Design an enzyme around this catalytic site. Structure first.
Site, PDB file in Angstrom:
ATOM      1  CD  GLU A   1      -2.130  97.065   6.068  1.00 27.57           C
ATOM      2  OE1 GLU A   1      -0.959  96.688   6.278  1.00 27.57           O
ATOM      3  OE2 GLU A   1      -3.078  96.841   6.845  1.00 27.57           O
ATOM      4  NE  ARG A   2       3.763  97.335   9.214  1.00 28.30           N
ATOM      5  CZ  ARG A   2       3.172  96.154   9.233  1.00 28.30           C
ATOM      6  NH1 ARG A   2       2.469  95.753   8.195  1.00 28.30           N
ATOM      7  NH2 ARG A   2       3.269  95.377  10.290  1.00 28.30           N
TER       8      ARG A   2
ATOM      9  CE  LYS B   1      -3.588  90.558   6.404  1.00 32.30           C
ATOM     10  NZ  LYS B   1      -2.660  90.444   7.541  1.00 32.30           N
TER      11      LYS B   1
HETATM   12  N1  LIG Z   1       6.650  85.038   1.420  1.00 29.51           N
HETATM   13  C1  LIG Z   1       7.413  85.187   2.499  1.00 29.51           C
HETATM   14  N2  LIG Z   1       8.625  84.583   2.528  1.00 29.51           N
HETATM   15  C2  LIG Z   1       9.389  84.737   3.617  1.00 29.51           C
HETATM   16  N3  LIG Z   1       9.140  85.420   4.731  1.00 29.51           N
HETATM   17  C3  LIG Z   1       7.933  86.007   4.676  1.00 29.51           C
HETATM   18  C4  LIG Z   1       7.037  85.941   3.627  1.00 29.51           C
HETATM   19  N4  LIG Z   1       5.894  86.671   3.921  1.00 29.51           N
HETATM   20  C5  LIG Z   1       6.116  87.153   5.118  1.00 29.51           C
HETATM   21  N5  LIG Z   1       7.334  86.791   5.634  1.00 29.51           N
HETATM   22  C6  LIG Z   1       7.876  87.163   6.935  1.00 29.51           C
HETATM   23  O1  LIG Z   1       6.807  87.544   7.771  1.00 29.51           O
HETATM   24  C7  LIG Z   1       6.733  88.991   7.863  1.00 29.51           C
HETATM   25  C8  LIG Z   1       5.325  89.436   7.553  1.00 29.51           C
HETATM   26  O2  LIG Z   1       5.201  89.678   6.129  1.00 29.51           O
HETATM   27  P1  LIG Z   1       3.962  90.554   5.608  1.00 29.51           P
HETATM   28  O3  LIG Z   1       3.562  90.086   4.249  1.00 29.51           O
HETATM   29  O4  LIG Z   1       4.267  92.003   5.797  1.00 29.51           O
HETATM   30  O5  LIG Z   1       2.825  90.126   6.656  1.00 29.51           O
HETATM   31  P2  LIG Z   1       1.487  90.862   7.180  1.00 29.51           P
HETATM   32  O6  LIG Z   1       1.184  91.944   6.174  1.00 29.51           O
HETATM   33  O7  LIG Z   1       0.420  89.796   7.230  1.00 29.51           O
HETATM   34  O8  LIG Z   1       1.824  91.412   8.544  1.00 29.51           O
HETATM   35  C9  LIG Z   1       7.829  89.520   6.927  1.00 29.51           C
HETATM   36  O9  LIG Z   1       8.425  90.703   7.447  1.00 29.51           O
HETATM   37  C10 LIG Z   1       8.823  88.358   6.888  1.00 29.51           C
HETATM   38  O10 LIG Z   1       9.713  88.361   7.983  1.00 29.51           O
HETATM   39 MG   LIG Z   2       0.473  94.079   6.136  1.00 31.67          MG
END
Ligand SMILES: Nc1ncnc2c1ncn2[C@@H]1O[C@H](COP(=O)(O)OP(=O)(O)O)[C@@H](O)[C@H]1O
Ligand SMILES: [Mg+2]
Ligand SMILES: Nc1ncnc2c1ncn2[C@@H]1O[C@H](COP(=O)(O)OP(=O)(O)OP(=O)(O)O)[C@@H](O)[C@H]1O
Ligand SMILES: [Mg+2]
Lengths: 210, 365, 281, 277, 177, 52, 52, 70, 52
Positions: free
Chosen positions: B58-59, B32
């Site tokens: 957040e980070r 997300k």
């Molecule tokens: N749209 C996407 N396509 C491919 N891999 C994704 C995608 N979104 C997330 N990921 C994978 O999952 C991880 C979490 O993404 P992120 O958006 O930072 O999630 P959150 O903020 O919910 O922890 C990413 O580092 C990647 O490995």
């Molecule tokens: Mg996040």
């Protein structure tokens, strides 16, 4: 504030700017789950703090695969622009062929049929798994890693029996000329002048079992 | 009025309102933030108004990444041409004490409210983890000497969250298109901080962990994400009908999961195992490569138009594409690229060339 | 299936985004369509109490009721989410007192407390800050009395007191179909019937997503239109057969010709009860 | 919610007993039906060395037979030869012939009328209830020669092992209608044999083709019955394995909900006590 | 006359050009038999391969040097390089000699082929050997078979088959060694 | 964790000798992720399962 | 579960007990009918995990 | 009988009952193992059906009536 | 479910070696010789590694 317990802690692992020194702090927080439940409270707290995730599987650990990396879950969206450029071009092939091996063995465990092309990638992915095993307290330099990944994804380790690859990737590093690893460490990259040379030195390898 | 995002599952099954509140639910690595960055990359670059990114809890690495990426894109300009920037960042990231994270969403909201009220124009407010506002009030309220509510949260959860969220509105003087990511604790949607957020949002986009473990990215649950724009009087008749047909196929497949698990695929009826095949096709087809994920995936990003999504999903629903494999639909743009990937993967099983094409054996000097 | 009389309390219980406010809005719009064809002693004046919703959703409903024409019969008592917790706690009682004018003057009322769960949440906040000791799910002790003394004001009065009526439609949102939660069991216990909607029937295309098994109406068919009663026992009985000979309909191979007629007949009936919204019949 | 999981656990724990039971039952049936199959395998050989094996004949009338199972918990066996009988009916039908489709087993009539409704004319079932005999196979054969075709095609799954079931197509020709015509090799390949019948060669070839159709129908529905048992034994062992895995995940999630329940009611009791004391 | 070369070699062609490629070409019963009829050899002198068959049993796969088969035109004997003969058998006894020892089965009736490579195939339905028949219930059955003459030709043929089986089972049960 | 650790951390090998403790482990509700065995198992170096 | 089968009154036969279910009190020929009914219904409840 | 334990009854019962109860509780240990398996009685092995019939004999043997201890 | 002679001869050897391993893990105990008669045997480590 148990989220603030770790986010106050793990945000201090930074890579600073050049105006502050360029120093860096790399963290490795360790979480012990209970039954493989990564949806616990503290586990999902730190998963939403940290950059990557190294998920160690307990059913891969009893099948001898050590380090028992769950390659499907184990992610690291921050090291991609931070890998060895010699490894970045040879392990881009490694994680995708392990993906197909994760797709074949997760459906074809019934013994239904061998499509004889999915049957190829089953004992190819079994070779990449056994190439990725490692003993304890014996780290490998990154140049002697990316040649063993070069020796396996380029099919030089093909038709070696899967209970030989621990002894066979030791045969690869021992017999290849040590000046190969010195060029690869210094360029950081398998140059066009080197993979033509490193393909040669892998054909002159006494693989076990023939 | 609709907001076309370029994301297939969003434009089909839960379309976003241009001027509405959008929520991305999911917990701890479901995607997300990559969804919010793809929404920034698609919507904010083609918007015309101003943007406000309020990073709440957040980070700090992600905030520095967004700041540097927005400097490269010209959305944030430095120095003498600074006034031609299109974004304000307000950062209250997760290293801050709980008084700061509980109040930085209000600061970003005020920066958006000035553009809505005084400048009188349409703005975008991206709030990463509005759950951290609720959590920071929950950390403070243990020490303000109160009886705790349910799971451990403050008694004033719903009214704090409501009084914050009721300011993020479109009014007659301006618009605020609000995209807020909402964390869920322990992947539990019945937790009171997501369950209270559910009522304040027009479009809900629930990202689930199991769909991400299937490889389907963006991991949007199509049977749990909703919209008030999914209405035949708003988006049209064929769009709403295609969306309801995709959701009917997916629900009929979800009802077949137990017997497929314990009896096997080989014991359903023929219409059931046609439903299973079409559902496995439209599950892969709802996934898409993101232009902000092309640095850690290697696939180029695929902006899909809304008409392309409706046409392709109508094609899979009627039965024009029962002939292609399942993986032809995995991570593609639209219905042309499923056929391109089909011939790309059925020339691959015929891809066996002679003599290995060496030209390397003793290259002269 | 769930026939509703003038003076009963019918719960609309469901998950989120399943059709609860849709059934309520259809019930109000239909009373607009019916008030033109009945004399003044038969009219129903609607009251919509919006507790804990947005101002955008309430403004959307007011725009809808003016475009349909329902606002010459509708009051809207809206305690939105930005309002104080005592206002969201007192807004159902305020709306019911504005609706009790019609019950007490011999006219007929229809009160709809949308999100009575949100009224219970506001009452919980207001009672936890007053240092009253919490109970189950940190709710007060008298959160049953909070809802019983409100829902008991919906009555069909005797002819000495005017013969007026007040029909209440409380709305309770559940969490993943959990009707074993505290406020869900309390309002299920209070009200006469319940209209249970499902998020799994909602995505089968069945809209309104009514769970025809768990939906009860304890006024029975005593408060049903005649003629609809002549078809309703049959429709209930064939739907009861279609429900039970299902959980075997996955095996469409073996044609049985006695169960299969029941299955496709119940399919005709289940497809019959689908309905587009904002157009009551 | 926390009780329905306890009933789902008991349901899956009982399914993991029922499927293990019928896996053992199908194993006991397979080990004694293999005995009859490898004894029945002998008599089909003299006809396929005397009459040859001609599948791709120019019959103008055919009877195809799809030999399926009666109990339908077999795992993709019956639809496999449905694919094969729609492949062989799209191999001989290129010249405008009449085809009759019959099926042995209730899983044949439920999967053949979906692919083809008009040529399907007969449904034999309840065959494997008591046992399979040769009087029964010959009665089925006589009801097949109630029609007058020039060929017969049998489709069945042959028990190669407990793992492999190769779908075999078996062909029989009508005696001098097509069998004498397909043997004419600048003369005949059947003139080497000296007929010791009571009547002429057409009558002994009529009796021989009826006897050949009977023995290949008997062997076909023995091989398919025991390969049905083997695919049920293998299909209820991938079923009890998945029902053990689903039960394990259900028990882990139930224990998580159990612990969260005890903590939740404990925290509410503590909050209610601290609100007073 | 030979204008349609059918066969498993050629069915593969028309099947592969007309069936979907996920199915391999189905097997055929000729793929499971090793011994053909017109091919070279399998006599080697005196003892030839005899294959005694019922649907429910295989009674002989061993090599025998002479077989005495009860044809409808009388008991004939099959020596080593016997002429190829499709012989319809009536109810009688089949004697498979190898030397001093021989196996005498009374059969029910059914054909017996001798092939141009010397392979002999006895194919009966019920081969009830002589030391498991009773000599008492045979007369109890042929008494009714002698008495009953119905009005229909079908049970007439059944009774004629009855008496020709039971009468032959008489002659081979008193005169046994 | 602190009470169990304060017990189990006195059972070590010193330079002078060692204590080796064999501890009977009861698992509540047959749940190995319950906090009493999940805290107790972090200290155990061997398990000796006596089965019927 | 008795009620959505349409059976009214939805009395669970295998959960309703009485102290008047002694053979001493209501006699043996009533108690045997009641015990046989409960036995038959309980065995049907056992068979429902196969026959469904 | 599978869940009810007595950790004393090793050498604390009637010796004439101890001669027989070991066999009785080991015959019931097989019946509880095969009982929910072979609910149907159609296609059964000649060893599993025998312990099923023995367990069904012992089960009806152990049940007794109220207020009449033996 | 199938039989002892169903599987191979190397499976026969796996059965035989494991059945004599299952018995060789048994041990007479010196404390239990008062009520089992036979004297108990303290097996060293260098002996059990070699024996297995
Ligand atoms: N749209 C996407 N396509 C491919 N891999 C994704 C995608 N979104 C997330 N990921 C994978 O999952 C991880 C979490 O993404 P992120 O958006 O930072 O999630 P959150 O903020 O919910 O922890 C990413 O580092 C990647 O490995
Ligand atoms: Mg996040
Ligand atoms: N019969 C119907 N036909 C078509 N669409 C419907 C029907 N009923 C409901 N919907 C749609 O489904 C969604 C249901 O939302 P609804 O108005 O029920 O909110 P709710 O469940 O009452 O409350 P919340 O918004 O908190 O979940 C709406 O988008 C509505 O337009
Ligand atoms: Mg609502």
């Amino acid at each position: 504030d148990v989220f603030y317990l770790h986010s106050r802690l793990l945000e201090r692992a930074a890579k600073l700017s050049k105006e502050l020194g360029g120093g860096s702090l790399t963290a490795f927080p360790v979480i012990e789950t209970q039954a493989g439940d990564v949806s616990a409270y503290i586990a999902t707290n730190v998963i939403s703090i940290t950059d990557g995730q190294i998920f160690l599987e307990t059913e891969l650990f009893y099948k001898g695969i050590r380090p028992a990396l769950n390659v499907g879950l184990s992610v690291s969206r921050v090291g991609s622009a931070a890998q060895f450029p010699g490894m970045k071009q040879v392990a881009g092939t490694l994680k995708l062929e392990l993906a197909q091996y994760r797709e074949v063995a997760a459906f074809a465990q019934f013994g239904s049929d061998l499509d004889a092309a999915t049957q190829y990638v089953l004992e190819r992915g079994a070779r990449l798994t056994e190439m990725l095993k490692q003993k304890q307290f014996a780290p490998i330099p990154i140049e002697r890693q990316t040649v063993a990944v070069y020796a396996a994804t380029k099919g030089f380790l093909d038709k070696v029996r899967v209970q030989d690859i621990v002894a066979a990737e030791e045969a690869v590093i021992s017999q290849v000329n040590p000046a190969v690893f010195k060029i690869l460490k210094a360029n950081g990259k398998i140059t066009p002048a080197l993979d033509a040379h490193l393909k040669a030195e892998l054909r002159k390898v006494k693989l076990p079992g023939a | 009025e609709i907001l076309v995002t370029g994301i297939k599952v969003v434009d089909l099954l839960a379309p976003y309102q241009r001027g509405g509140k959008i929520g991305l639910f999911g917990g701890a690595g479901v995607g997300k933030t990559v969804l919010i960055m793809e929404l920034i990359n698609n919507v904010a670059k083609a918007h015309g108004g101003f943007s406000v990114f309020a990073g709440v809890g957040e980070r700090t690495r992600e905030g520095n990444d967004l700041y540097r990426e927005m400097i490269e894109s010209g959305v944030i300009k430095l120095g003498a041409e600074r006034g031609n920037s299109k974004c304000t960042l307000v950062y209250g990231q997760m290293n801050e004490p709980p008084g700061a994270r509980a109040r930085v969403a209000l600061t970003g909201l005020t920066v958006a409210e000035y553009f809505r009220d005084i400048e009188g124009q349409d703005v975008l407010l991206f709030v990463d983890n509005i759950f951290r506002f609720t959590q920071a009030n929950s950390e403070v309220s243990a020490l303000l000497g109160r009886i705790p509510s349910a799971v451990g949260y403050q008694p004033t959860l719903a009214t704090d969250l409501g009084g914050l969220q009721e300011r993020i509105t479109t009014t007659t003087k301006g618009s605020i298109t609000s995209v807020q990511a909402v964390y869920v604790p322990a992947d539990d949607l019945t937790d009171p901080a997501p369950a209270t957020t559910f009522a304040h949002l027009d479009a809900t986009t629930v990202l689930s962990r199991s769909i991400a473990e299937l490889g389907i990215y963006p991991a949007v649950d199509p049977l749990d994400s909703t919209s008030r724009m999914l209405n035949p009087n708003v988006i049209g008749a064929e769009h709403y009908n295609v969306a309801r047909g995709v959701q009917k196929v997916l629900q009929d497949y979800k009802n077949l999961q137990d017997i497929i698990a314990i009896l096997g695929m080989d014991e359903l009826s023929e219409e059931d195992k046609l439903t299973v095949a079409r559902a496995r096709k439209i599950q892969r087809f709802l996934s898409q490569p993101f232009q902000v994920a092309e640095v850690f995936t290697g696939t180029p990003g695929k902006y899909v138009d809304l008409a392309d999504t409706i046409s392709g999903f109508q094609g899979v629903l009627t039965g024009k594409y029962d002939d292609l494999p399942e993986m032809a639909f995995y991570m593609v743009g639209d219905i042309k690229e499923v056929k391109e990937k089909a011939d790309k993967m059925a020339k691959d099983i015929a891809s066996r060339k002679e003599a290995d094409n060496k030209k390397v054996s003793e290259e002269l000097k | 299936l769930v026939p509703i009389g003038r003076g009963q309390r019918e719960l609309i219980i469901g998950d989120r985004q399943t059709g609860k406010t849709a059934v309520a809005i259809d019930a109000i719009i239909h009373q607009k369509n019916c008030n033109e064809q009945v004399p003044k002693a038969q009219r129903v004046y609607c009251v919509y109490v919006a507790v804990g919703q947005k101002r955008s959703t309430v403004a959307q409903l007011v725009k809808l009721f003016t475009q349909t024409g329902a606002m010459r019969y509708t009051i809207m008592v809206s305690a939105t989410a930005s309002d104080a917790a005592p206002l969201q706690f007192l807004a159902p009682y305020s709306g019911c007192a504005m609706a009790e004018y019609f019950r007490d003057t011999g006219k007929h009322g229809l009160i709809i407390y949308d999100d009575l769960s949100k009224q219970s949440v506001a009452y919980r906040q207001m009672s936890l800050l007053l240092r009253r000791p919490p109970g189950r799910e940190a709710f007060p002790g008298d959160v049953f009395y909070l809802h019983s003394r409100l829902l008991e004001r919906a009555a069909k009065l005797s002819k000495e007191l005017g013969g007026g009526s007040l029909t209440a439609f409380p709305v309770i949102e559940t969490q993943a179909g959990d009707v074993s939660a505290y406020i869900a069991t309390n309002v299920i216990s209070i009200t006469d019937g319940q209209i249970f909607l499902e998020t799994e029937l909602f995505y089968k295309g069945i809209r309104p997503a009514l769970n025809v098994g768990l939906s009860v109406s304890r006024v029975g068919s005593a408060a049903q239109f005649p003629g609809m009663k002549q078809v309703a026992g049959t429709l209930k009985l064939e739907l009861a057969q279609y429900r039970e000979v299902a959980a075997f309909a996955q095996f469409g191979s073996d044609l049985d010709a006695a169960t299969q007629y029941v299955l496709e007949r119940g399919a005709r009936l289940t497809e019959m009860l689908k309905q587009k919204q904002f157009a009551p019949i | 919610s926390n009780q329905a999981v306890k009933q789902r656990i008991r349901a899956i724990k009982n399914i993991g007993k029922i499927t293990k039971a019928m896996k053992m039952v199908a194993a006991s049936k397979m080990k004694n039906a293999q005995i009859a199959v490898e004894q029945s395998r002998g008599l089909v050989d003299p006809f396929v060395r005397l009459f040859g094996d001609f599948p791709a004949v120019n019959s103008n009338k055919s009877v195809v037979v799809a030999v399926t199972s009666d109990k339908g918990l077999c795992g993709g066996l019956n639809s496999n030869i449905t694919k094969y009988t729609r492949a062989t009916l799209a191999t001989t039908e290129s010249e405008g012939k009449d085809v009759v489709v019959v099926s042995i087993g209730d899983k044949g009539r439920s999967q053949l009328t979906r692919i083809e409704s008009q040529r399907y004319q007969l449904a034999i079932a309840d065959t494997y209830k008591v046992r399979v005999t040769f009087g029964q196979a010959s009665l089925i054969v006589e009801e097949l020669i109630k029609h007058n075709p020039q060929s017969y095609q049998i489709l069945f799954n042959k028990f190669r092992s407990a793992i492999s079931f190769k779908p075999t197509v078996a062909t029989i020709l009508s005696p001098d209608l097509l069998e004498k015509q397909l043997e004419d090799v600048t003369g005949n390949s059947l003139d080497a044999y000296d007929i010791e019948a009571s009547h002429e060669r057409s009558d002994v070839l009529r009796d021989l083709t009826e006897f050949h159709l009977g023995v290949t129908l008997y062997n076909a529905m023995l091989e398919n019955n025991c390969s049905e048992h083997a695919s049920r034994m293998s299909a209820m062992e991938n079923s009890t394995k998945s029902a053990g895995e689903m039960l394990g995940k259900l028990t882990l999630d139930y224990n998580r909900k159990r612990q969260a329940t005890i903590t939740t009611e404990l925290i509410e009791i503590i909050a209610g006590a601290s609100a007073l004391m | 006359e030979a204008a349609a070369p059918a066969g498993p070699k050629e069915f593969t062609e028309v099947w592969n050009k007309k069936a979907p490629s996920t199915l391999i070409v189905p097997e055929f019963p000729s793929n499971y038999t090793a011994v053909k009829a017109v091919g070279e050899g399998q006599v080697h002198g005196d003892a030839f391969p005899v294959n005694f068959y019922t649907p429910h049993s295989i009674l002989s796969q061993a090599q025998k040097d002479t077989v005495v088969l009860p044809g409808v035109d009388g008991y004939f004997g099959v020596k080593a390089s016997h002429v190829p003969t499709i012989a319809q058998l009536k109810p009688g006894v089949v004697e498979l000699h190898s030397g001093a020892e021989s196996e005498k089965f009374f059969v029910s009736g059914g054909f017996a082929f001798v092939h141009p490579n010397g392979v002999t195939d006895i194919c009966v339905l019920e081969a009830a050997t002589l030391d498991q028949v009773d000599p008492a219930a045979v007369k109890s059955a042929l008494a009714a078979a002698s008495a009953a003459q119905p009005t229909d030709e079908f049970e007439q043929a059944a009774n004629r088959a009855a008496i020709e089986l039971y009468s032959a089972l008489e002659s081979a049960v008193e005169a046994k060694a």
